[PDB]
């Protein structure tokens, strides 16, 4: 909800709309006022700061590591995680067992191909 209690003497439904030159002059006056009065980082109007990754209780260490990895990528929107082993779900071709291959090694390769 809003917390601004400042009152400005403006009735835009009854008062005339400011001109673009008048709006530019008002913007210049506001800029001069902001140059004269320095900004206060500890102002009550500013909201509380966001807690860090370690300060957040809901953020897990795995989530913090993933967020750091996403931030380290130059394109976090285009950053993608590593895909799983899709070759394990692919079609297993017939293994080519050479004549110099051992019987135990050929049997193990055949068993692995049969399991796949």
């Amino acid at each position: 909800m809003p917390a601004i209690t400042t009152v400005h003497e403006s009735l835009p439904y009854i008062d005339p709309e400011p001109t673009p030159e008048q709006r530019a002059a008002a913007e210049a006056l506001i800029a001069e006022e902001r140059a004269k009065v320095p900004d206060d980082p500890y102002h009550a109007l500013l909201p509380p700061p966001l807690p860090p990754l370690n300060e957040s209780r809901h953020l897990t260490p795995i989530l913090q590591n993933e967020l750091a990895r996403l931030a380290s990528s130059p394109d976090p929107q285009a950053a993608k995680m590593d895909a799983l082993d899709f070759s394990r779900y692919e079609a297993p071709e017939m293994p080519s067992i050479d004549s110099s291959q051992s019987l135990e090694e050929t049997a193990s390769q055949l068993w692995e191909t049969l399991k796949q």
Binding site: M1, P2, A91, P92, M94, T106, A107, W111, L114
Partner: protein, 96 residues
């Protein structure tokens, strides 16, 4: 006895019906494993072809429903964003 059979002999070896107790030759076991692998590959190829045909038929049947659901979801997201913007505008208008 069954646990000892499944621990000494492999589970995949015990599952195959061509792994006999008297078949200690590696060549016969390798030939049986190759035949079983060829049969499994043929069965997997047939199952993959049938599943591909079924998936193509299902996609051709339900592509319109999927597109309608996607369009409705996009419209719902845009409406939620507009509702948040309108709520903020209403709060600001009340304060003003």
């Amino acid at each position: 006895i069954w646990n000892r059979r499944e621990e000494n002999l492999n589970a995949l070896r015990l599952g195959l019906g061509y792994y006999d107790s008297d078949s200690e030759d590696g060549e016969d076991d390798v030939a049986n494993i190759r035949a079983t692998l060829e049969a499994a590959l043929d069965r997997l190829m047939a199952s993959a072809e049938k599943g591909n045909k079924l998936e193509k038929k299902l996609n051709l049947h339900l592509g319109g429903y999927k597109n309608r659901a996607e369009m409705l979801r996009k419209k719902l997201g845009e409406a939620h964003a507009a509702l948040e913007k309108a709520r903020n505008a209403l709060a600001g208008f009340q304060v003003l």
